[PDB]
Amino acid sequence: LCLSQQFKAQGDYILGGLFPLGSTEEATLNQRTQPNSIPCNRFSPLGLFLAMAMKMAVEEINNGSALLPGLRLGYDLFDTCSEPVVTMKSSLMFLAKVGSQSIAAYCNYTQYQPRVLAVIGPHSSELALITGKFFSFFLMPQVSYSASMDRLSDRETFPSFFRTVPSDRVQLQAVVTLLQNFSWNWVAALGSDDDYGREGLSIFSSLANARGICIAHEGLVPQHDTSGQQLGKVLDVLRQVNQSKVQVVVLFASARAVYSLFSYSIHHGLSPKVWVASESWLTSDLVMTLPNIARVGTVLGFLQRGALLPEFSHYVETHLALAADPAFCASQRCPRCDDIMLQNLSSGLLQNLLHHQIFATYAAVYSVAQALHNTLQCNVSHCHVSEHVLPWQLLENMYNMSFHARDLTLQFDAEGNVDMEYDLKMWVWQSPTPVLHTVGTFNGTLQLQQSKMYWPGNQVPVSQCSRQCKDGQVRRVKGFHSCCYDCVDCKAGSYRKHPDDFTCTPCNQDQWSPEKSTACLPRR
Amino acid sequence: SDFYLPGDYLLGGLFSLHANFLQVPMCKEYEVKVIGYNLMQAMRFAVEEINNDSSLLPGVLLGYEIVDVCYISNNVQPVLYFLAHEDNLLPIQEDYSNYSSRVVAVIGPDNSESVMTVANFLSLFLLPQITYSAISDELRDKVRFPALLRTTPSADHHIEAMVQLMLHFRWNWIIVLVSNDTYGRDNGQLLGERVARRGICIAFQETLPTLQPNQNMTSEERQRLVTIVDKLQQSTARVVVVFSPDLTLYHFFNEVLRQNFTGAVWIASESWAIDPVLHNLTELRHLGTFLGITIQSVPIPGFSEFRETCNQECDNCLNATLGERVVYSVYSAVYAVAHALHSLLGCDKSTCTKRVVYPWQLLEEIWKVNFTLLDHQIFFDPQGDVALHLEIVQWQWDRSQNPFQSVASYYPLQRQLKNIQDISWHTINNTIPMSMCSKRCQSGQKKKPVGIHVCCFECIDCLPGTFLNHTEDEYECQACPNNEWSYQSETSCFKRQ
């Protein structure tokens, strides 16, 4: 197929795109020693589907006069290659003057005139951080469909970054509300060693401490399975989870880390626990393949509630068919992409669950288009055509808008995030295959269909700790922070000298003390 | 201005001389920071001294282009300015092996975040960057940061020094206070990793609020500080490690003073170990012992009499002035670049040739230098760090002597703490203060663990007919032979008739 040629289109204004259209095997990741080019080794269907979503959105906008009436909107899509060097090359190309092959080191944004109006940003949060920092200097407005790390919310370092997916903080606030509802006061917090997991643990540990949720253990699990230190570390994490007597574990970890942890947990025969999931695991590109999932004990977590695109699959198939026809072609950015036929992109891939990111890409295109529609002060059928909009001019309107996806209004807030609802999904194993069931919703408030909750047995799990002790007891602090206590009962022959952590004192010889008593007593 | 010198080859330098999104921020909005001015002068002294040294670059002049950076708030523009060549234009192309930039090497930023930001840009060109104060361990990844080097140890060695200080004085039981920043969480996690391997238990870890010293404090933040100090007071641990920027700790220590807290050992990380502003608070001398882990000072001989279109003209620094421990890193960075260039040009005494150099080759040569500078041997470990000595300083308030007194020295290549001297403690008789979670057993007593931490145990007597062999186990008793017996809590058996 002549498919990679479909990544560029002319127009009055042009949108840049960064997508995971290709990748490489691990053998390439050695230290760079000479500044040569990096080859396109491996194809990626996810990037192709997201690029198709952007193409579809722009095609719709060019058909329907509701936005940018009389204007033509173009696009220019590039592969990230999941590589910062290639991503930086593409980012630099976006910012160069049209027709030129170079960029000028001017001191401030007003002197530039880049060839694209906005950039629909990369898939991963790492490239989002990098390219957001770079783009902010030029005030190039960047909308990401996938990058959820909350560090990007900072308007000081990211004054021009937007996204059509909520940040991790909202998901973790939903999780904290879930723990608060079931009175799970005593929990263990785990995260992946990647920045995703470290920032997730930071956010959750900040949110839980404010609401009286006591974290028994806070730890990181590795991404890899290639050194004995990692086996020892997962064994130690299992030891920590066991010794703390926790029954509910929050696991804000990537799918590879969860796969490692769960495989080793099955290997070591860990007893059932409640596991509170995160989206990147819960959507399970990898984890749900494990043979013995049902022994892990219970899986539960929140998931996005965005709209759906019924026509996307037929659009993809239609344009692949068009790319297969030489009579159409008579009318690279990823050389491996041309080797792909329809059967390699079977509908079974699209019927899985990728809907969230595809819709987010569609909505990002629509957000940029609506912002431009506002900046040009468009009427019905007419626009302020007498001037050419620069990106920093679009940025002014992009903060103060509402835009329509398919039957869904969205708005960028003061920190560039959208507001969205969530479903609460519980894994059901009574079916012959693990399947997600909706058991509640979150929209800033948590609604639970508790009559539908699939707990094991006729009981709801519990994990709790004492916030204060009784008078006839001695305190003892526990937890990653000294937040809660376990209680000691003073046995006969000893007394609670202080109403405090101080251990019970042995009884005075000429006296005696019964159980739980606070003082020595004459034996007569 | 003095921000620029012409020459055959130019070094780039980034230093922070100063402390509506459509409004472009400018450094002049912030007060002068004298440390960055000292570092700039260190670079200038090094480069001009090299130009005077006929044996290093005979007939070749090192120039420089220095640009002021307001920490993170301006990091893109200087890099583009450094990279551009003809008419301030920078070509975009796939292969840069044949391209020559304005500068051949960069003396990079101070903050780890800014170092990473600049590194991600320069990695595209493999233009070498040497940095002087960013201790973050993440910079050791040369897949991620191929062109980045350091003239200073990393957080690995600071935490090693802390842990070996704990081990030497037999402290089993510590508290960790961290900032909300990436710095505090990074160092807290690293310390948590290191202690578990060495037998030290962290009682609890707690996060300080992001306060600023001159500004007013809200009621909830005040209560947060109150809660943290309550947790300090309740605990039996009396060794406290604080990973926080100095400016934040004024309020925290004011609260600690207000609650009349006293009797702890405070272990300071390099970000506040030598702060005069905290030190001059007269009442800190009553809170306990303050020990700080920091890079060791190296005196530059001639430096004192030398010192005394945008972001290249800041006149205010002089009258603000009218960094000793960090200066040597900048000095040695300039000298490292100079030696790498001296090698790259194929140069020899009085016989240089001014060949055209592309930075990616100078990086390859910078990895290769090994020479003695100012009586210390500087070369780069494969992970990019120069092995400079660290030291441990105790704060002193007798103004007859220096505020910070060296009490120990740490060697990263030998990876051990050495030359420990007489710390003067807060105790009643200058005895070493001890923090242990539980008291050691009497002979013939078994340990019974309490809770999660290894250091927590009850001591319980062995019953008659059982004995405990301390060379063999300590957590359960073992029975006497079939014709032996024992005196209850006793290490040994005896024969029955």
Residue numbers in the entry:
A (entry chain B): 23 to 353, 367 to 388, 393 to 563
B (entry chain A): 25 to 43, 52 to 340, 358 to 371, 381 to 555
Please give me the paper's original passages concerning this structure:
We first determined the structure of the human/mouse sweet receptor in the absence of sweeteners. To improve the resolution, we combined all particles to generate a global reconstruction at 3.1 Å resolution, then performed local refinement focused on the VFT/CRD region or the 7TM domain, obtaining final resolutions of 2.9 Å and 3.6 Å, respectively. In the unliganded (apo) state, TAS1R2 and TAS1R3 show a highly asymmetric architecture, and their extracellular domains are markedly tilted relative to the membrane plane. In our apo sweet receptor structure, the two subunits pack closely against each other at both the upper and lower lobes of the VFT domains, as well as at the 7TM domains. This sharply contrasts with the apo states of mGluRs and the calcium-sensing receptor (CaSR), where the dimer interface is restricted to the VFT upper lobes (LB1s), while the lower lobes (LB2s) and 7TM domains remain largely disengaged. The tight packing of the sweet receptor is facilitated by interactions between VFT domains and CRDs, with the VFT LB2s held together by loops extending from the CRDs. Phe519 and His520 from TAS1R3 CRD are wedged deeply into the cleft between the two LB2s, effectively clasping them together, whereas equivalent residues Ile510 and His511 from TAS1R2 also extend into the VFT layer. This configuration reinforces the dimer interface and would enable the VFT domain of one subunit to directly communicate with the CRD of the other subunit, potentially allowing efficient cross-subunit allosteric coupling. Notably, such an arrangement differs from other class C GPCRs, where the VFT layer and the CRD remain structurally separated.
